[model samples]
Target: GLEVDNNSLLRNIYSTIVYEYSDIVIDFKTSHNLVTKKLDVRDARDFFINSEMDEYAANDFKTGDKIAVFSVPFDWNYLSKGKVTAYTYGGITPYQPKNIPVNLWINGKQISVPYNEISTNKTTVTAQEIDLKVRKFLIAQHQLYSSGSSYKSGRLVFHTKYSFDLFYVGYRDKESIFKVYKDNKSFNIDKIGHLDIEIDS
Candidate 1:
């Protein structure tokens, strides 16, 4: 093994540096249509059109996924080429900060713009607050479907009254899972709620 050619197995530091520095944000557009004067939206691609988009789908997203779309101004590059100061390298600059406002749309609705303000700061929020937010989002979607604001070929049924008390359990450190419990009996830990709807028109 000591016998070797002049060529050595060396790491290309330039490629490594470029790979480390390059990061991309996935962008997707919201495609929508007016259905009998009602608005319907979904992810725009070459795939299905008028496909029902689930609101809970966002919670299933992971890293490198396009959570929303943004339209940067035409002169963003020029504007971000900001001026230099005395502290900078002899009137030269490295990079400038650009405030590109983004309008976040989820499912089919455009939500409030994403932004940061010095007046508001929330480092730590309680679990209850998070739970409430999740519950509200879920409930809002359910109500929308039930009220016919959203489209469904078949009737979408939601049961407010339940047979069991949904209990949250911790499998690991502070981890939580919802389970159905009735009379001190435990059901499946992670089965989604289902309903049998019989509609007559």
Candidate 2:
């Protein structure tokens, strides 16, 4: 009776974790079980690259780097200031995802493609591609515990080994959360329907 309830897994377990503060042991059963230990949660935002730093990010990035997002300071672009730290996500390991498919949007248009195909990378990877890749990579990680996948407990143990929660939230933050306020126009504060990037299969 193995049923891969992808939506349920994400909404119930993965998305609920507070990486920097997941100090409690999660345990339960639904024909499944838990109660792993010593795992901390991270905010989903920490796992995506800042699309705002497009050109700069594209140029400075090295193909294969460690986990955790780019915690570049707001003023970093002023003089090329940059550094990679595990901060809240916790530097668990280097994430090297190979052509994972994802759903992306540009100018209010949905573009479903593999993370690697988002931009022209004949010479280099673009900021857009890297950002989406970071997101999809996080999604792929949860597959190991997809409930109805091949082996149940065995795959769950793998995640536990790295001091991670039994599950991870496959969530996406918005490309433009909110615009800078301006008094020039009265309609400036109008609401945009949905801001989230809406990744995950």
Candidate 3:
């Protein structure tokens, strides 16, 4: 019988499959004749994108059975600094930087999304939107390796008004000076600072 499973099923299967760091291969058995089944092993996270659930169970594998596997890592925001800065400024300024250039690091390699390129000249791209795009792009890459023998991988980084603090200064030779600390109240701000002005001469 032909059976299919969605991401949740895959997630479930993945949970049972220990992450050995070296074990990249997933094993399965195919039966020549209808035989007694062992254990059911297919399940995963079942909700996503504004509350949606599409799931299924797998039947025992048969010879020549083709399976597709995708490994979705934990959301990047949870593990690493969500905001990455390309440059920094010091002293004072008439205007705080806006529409700053953003870089994404995927698999330790930098991916650039110039300030002018986002949303066709929209000055700012929200962290939410950038993350959304990255995940969508990643899933597409995962699909590219649908053949059971192949695998896909990627990493991404981006910024937003909430996840990043712009225009910060670091004191001379002090790594602790004016750093953007994550969830550390001493160095964190509830909201990003902005400036407004008009000049009269």
Q: Could you say which candidate leads in TM-score?
A: 3
Q: Candidate 2 has which clashing residue pairs, if any?
A: 14-168, 14-169, 18-41, 19-41, 19-42, 20-41
Q: How well does each candidate superpose onto the true structure, as a TM-score?
A: 0.16, 0.18, 0.21
Residues 1-59, model 3: lDDT tens digits: 11122232322322321110111121322221111111122232211101001111122
Q: What shift in Å separates residue 177 of candidate 1 from its native position after superposition?
A: 8.1
Scanning candidate 2 in windows of ten residues, the lowest lDDT window is 178-187
Task: Output the lDDT of residue 115, model 1.
Answer: 37
Using lDDT, give the best candidate's number: 2
Off by over 4 Å in 1: 1-104, 108-110, 113-123, 134-146, 151-201
Predicted candidate 2 versus true structure: per-residue lDDT over 1-201, tens digit per residue: 222554344333333222222122222111111112222322322222121222322233233322222121111111222322121111111122223233444334664544454222112222222332333344465343344543222111111011112223223221111111001011111121111232222
User: What is the descending lDDT order?
Assistant: 2, 3, 1
Candidate 3 residues lying further than 4 Å off, grouped into runs, are 1-100, 114-117, 120-127, 138-201
C-alpha lDDT of all candidate models, in order? 0.19, 0.26, 0.24
Alpha-carbon shift of residue 114 in model 1 (angstroms): 8.3
